[PDB]
Structure 1
């Protein structure tokens, strides 16, 4: 909640064009162009025609009246504990009201504060005095806050989150206040409570957005920091491979098909002169069982692609150099049942994994530029131990390999 960050002066950024001064949720059986769910300023389902993003932000005007800034409310509350009582209208001045509070705020801040307890807050109030009172409160895009239509016994009804209720309530309260000319002549003293409710609703709007961050905005973003879910990824068991170079590997039929699907569909469309959807039908048929034709397209990709077909192999935990390795797909297996990645025994020591049923993550790299940059993680570059500069025994001959050379030479 409480964060130290730059504040924004709403009045400068406020745009009169996207101003919601109409509180009506619907107008004459239609979504109001001036309503909260406005296609003109916020956008609609046809968002490509609109060219208006989620960033589109609506505005509401409280002029000629000012409210306490919702973000700055808590610090004022700590400085002035009686803020909740004082704002309501029912020392020298007590419980004067919101409009009266504005006129005497500077004196009141000195009047009811403990300097030692809240000096930093008081200094902040002096620093950002101009931003204490707000004339316009922003409303975020209706695309973020959906209103799903439902059928009702009396009539079709729109279900929507409470945030929309908070916004429309605020606009409803303000709309009547500005209209009255001869009503207001002496009513102005009981008009103040109406403004008070608006301030509380805006505070809940601020609190709800804080909860919105918890509900898959900040939680999802920090979950992404916890674990970014990458497409074009795979998990596979490792099996020993013999007779092929160390960097090259053998990949199962199913593994290659999914990761290089779009590359595979490109070739089938070009070779057979078919639509992309029709090419997908060929790929779907191949997924079910081994067919030589799709294997031929897969074999051509590994054979003829520039830089080869390469990927990154990581064994978690990724705590050591060589945990993630840049490798090449030498062969594609012709057994549908075989679902094990074939790796050289020399790679195993660097990865620190075992052929005990452990699974390694496969992340293919496509761009030739990206392929080159990740080639610094290749096994060939890791033949040199980085601390010593000597050859790394991790990539040296292992148990079975050493014995054969020993019998040969010794």
Structure 2
């Protein structure tokens, strides 16, 4: 399933409120409400109170003359080679000039511009059609007369668009990303068509090359906004969609610890105070009884300097929780079986200056770490159903080898304890 490609007709999609008119983005030291930097439709950059969402879509009319869509254009170039030349109108001397004066007529198919090519699109396709190589492309064109020509052009949210108005040292510089740049040209270019109200042949002699640059810039738009927005690891499709940022997280450096079973681990007081901030704020609101704001004040004072009462509160919290306030520990970069662990908090370190995370020695091999300075990441877990689901990630589950079904060697005794047991036995 998923989000399916289809160049659905824009006319039934398009809405009158989102059709932008020609205007400069700025106006008298203020963003114009009619240009691409409109606040009427299109959000507010500094303010997030805009009830309308960031996913509003802007829109440009080209109904007068329909234009081939850029997305299928490359496919078009496949079905008909060098259609860029056919739409390229050099057959003109009034304004284009004599120039080369020698050109490839190719049966007068070339230098007819976009309008004529649209008029005889079927004939040109019949002229350039390979039943053995380009047949599939021509068939997919057959299923798609309705979508080849597009009458509406969309534009991204200005809040999504990182383009900003900086104040350069020379002067106020509208530092836009390149996107709207071409878009501006586009709309400025379309201005000429709605500027060219008067009818005369020489105008059309200039109007057709304007359509040529229209399609050229449309292809520019698609290629550019796919170059970086949705390409590579910088691209949006991999940076966020699969994995993203986490708001409840911390990271720390690990040190050995003894006197406890393998599963129990201890966390520094400061990081535990920050992670479960709202659990403590809840308990403190209940017990103090006053509103949550003064409770927030108390919690601030608590993280600022060591307090006995707050430590008692967290001790009660660890004692009385259903799941023991477990979390996920993962070791950058996780490339081995069970490189993530589901561990349960056992003790809060009392010493304020201590900031290292205690961990039992036997877990060193499974997560492939060392006390040399590795930085490991902790993700707390809250939902009870989540606790049950991630119970399969507990080290007790990893105790069985999913490879051979024997006792796991990574949880086997490490170096020093092997030595000591050897002394005891032999």
Residue pair 1:237, 1:341 contacting (<8 A) in 2 also:
yes
Q: Which whole-Å CA distance do the structure 1 matches of 2:48 and 2:372 have between them?
A: 51
Residue pair 1:149, 1:156 contacting (<8 A) in 2 also:
yes
Aligned runs of 1:9-408 on 2, under 5 Å? Answer: 9-26=9-26, 31-45=31-45, 49-89=49-89, 91-112=107-128, 116=132, 118-146=134-162, 148-149=164-165, 158-178=174-194, 180-184=196-200, 187-213=203-229, 219-224=235-240, 228-272=244-288, 279-280=295-296, 282-287=298-303, 289-315=305-331, 318=334, 321-348=337-364, 350-351=366-367, 353-354=369-370, 358-386=374-402, 395=411
Structure 1 residue 293, shift from structure 2 partner: 3.3
- TM-score normalised by length of structure 1: 0.81
Q: Which whole-Å CA distance do the structure 1 matches of 2:315 and 2:266 have between them?
A: 12
1:26 counterpart SS class: coil
Q: Return closer, same or farther for 1:239/1:218 CA change in 2, 3 Å cut-off.
A: closer
Q: Return closer, same or farther for 1:187/1:339 CA change in 2, 3 Å cut-off.
A: closer
Q: Return closer, same or farther for 1:406/1:341 CA change in 2, 3 Å cut-off.
A: same
Q: Which whole-Å CA distance do the structure 2 matches of 1:353 and 1:180 have between them?
A: 71
- With 111-120 and 53-62 compared, the bigger mean Cα shift is at 111-120
- With 115-124 and 198-207 compared, the bigger mean Cα shift is at 115-124
- With 325-334 and 232-241 compared, the bigger mean Cα shift is at 232-241
Q: Which whole-Å CA distance do the structure 1 matches of 2:376 and 2:207 have between them?
A: 68
Residue deviations 1:207-229, cap 9 Å, x none?
A: 22113415899624424589644
1:349 counterpart SS class: coil
Residue pair 1:236, 1:360 contacting (<8 A) in 2 also:
yes
Q: Which whole-Å CA distance do the structure 1 matches of 2:67 and 2:382 have between them?
A: 54
Q: Return closer, same or farther for 1:67/1:241 CA change in 2, 3 Å cut-off.
A: same
Structure 1 residue 304, shift from structure 2 partner: 2.4
What is the aligned residue count?
A: 409
1:50 counterpart SS class: coil
Structure 1 residue 78, shift from structure 2 partner: 3.7
Q: Which whole-Å CA distance do the structure 2 matches of 1:167 and 1:11 have between them?
A: 20
- With 55-64 and 117-126 compared, the bigger mean Cα shift is at 117-126
Structure 1 residue 396, shift from structure 2 partner: 6.3
Structure 1 residue 123, shift from structure 2 partner: 3.1
- With 382-391 and 257-266 compared, the bigger mean Cα shift is at 382-391
Q: Return closer, same or farther for 1:405/1:40 CA change in 2, 3 Å cut-off.
A: same
- With 308-317 and 58-67 compared, the bigger mean Cα shift is at 308-317
Residue deviations 1:55-90, cap 9 Å, x none?
A: 21111111220122111222223443442332233x
- With 381-390 and 126-135 compared, the bigger mean Cα shift is at 381-390
Q: Which whole-Å CA distance do the structure 1 matches of 2:245 and 2:363 have between them?
A: 26
2:357 counterpart SS class: strand
The runs of 5 or more residues in structure 1 that have no matched partner are: none
The runs of 5 or more residues in structure 2 that have no matched partner are: 90-106
- With 229-238 and 188-197 compared, the bigger mean Cα shift is at 229-238
Residue deviations 1:289-325, cap 9 Å, x none?
A: 5332332232222122232121123345645554433
Q: Return closer, same or farther for 1:37/1:184 CA change in 2, 3 Å cut-off.
A: farther
Residue pair 1:23, 1:175 contacting (<8 A) in 2 also:
no
Residue pair 2:45, 2:158 contacting (<8 A) in 1 also:
no
Q: Which whole-Å CA distance do the structure 2 matches of 1:225 and 1:354 have between them?
A: 32
- With 255-264 and 142-151 compared, the bigger mean Cα shift is at 142-151
- With 137-146 and 41-50 compared, the bigger mean Cα shift is at 41-50
Structure 1 residue 41, shift from structure 2 partner: 2.1
Residue deviations 1:189-236, cap 9 Å, x none?
A: 432122222222222222221134158996244245896443433333
- With 190-199 and 237-246 compared, the bigger mean Cα shift is at 237-246
Q: Return closer, same or farther for 1:156/1:342 CA change in 2, 3 Å cut-off.
A: closer
Q: Which whole-Å CA distance do the structure 1 matches of 2:284 and 2:255 have between them?
A: 31
Q: Which whole-Å CA distance do the structure 2 matches of 1:364 and 1:7 have between them?
A: 43
Structure 1 residue 161, shift from structure 2 partner: 3.3
Structure 1 residue 99, shift from structure 2 partner: 0.7
1:186 counterpart SS class: helix
Residue pair 2:87, 2:110 contacting (<8 A) in 1 also:
no
Q: Which whole-Å CA distance do the structure 1 matches of 2:120 and 2:73 have between them?
A: 17
Q: Return closer, same or farther for 1:290/1:155 CA change in 2, 3 Å cut-off.
A: closer
Structure 1 residue 369, shift from structure 2 partner: 1.7
- TM-score normalised by length of structure 2: 0.78
Q: Which whole-Å CA distance do the structure 1 matches of 2:233 and 2:55 have between them?
A: 14
Structure 1 residue 33, shift from structure 2 partner: 3.6
Structure 1 residue 183, shift from structure 2 partner: 3.4
Residue deviations 1:339-368, cap 9 Å, x none?
A: 343334444454454556555432221222
Q: Which whole-Å CA distance do the structure 1 matches of 2:335 and 2:186 have between them?
A: 54
Residue deviations 1:82-105, cap 9 Å, x none?
A: 42332233x044311211111111
Q: Which whole-Å CA distance do the structure 2 matches of 1:267 and 1:135 have between them?
A: 60
Q: Return closer, same or farther for 1:83/1:280 CA change in 2, 3 Å cut-off.
A: same
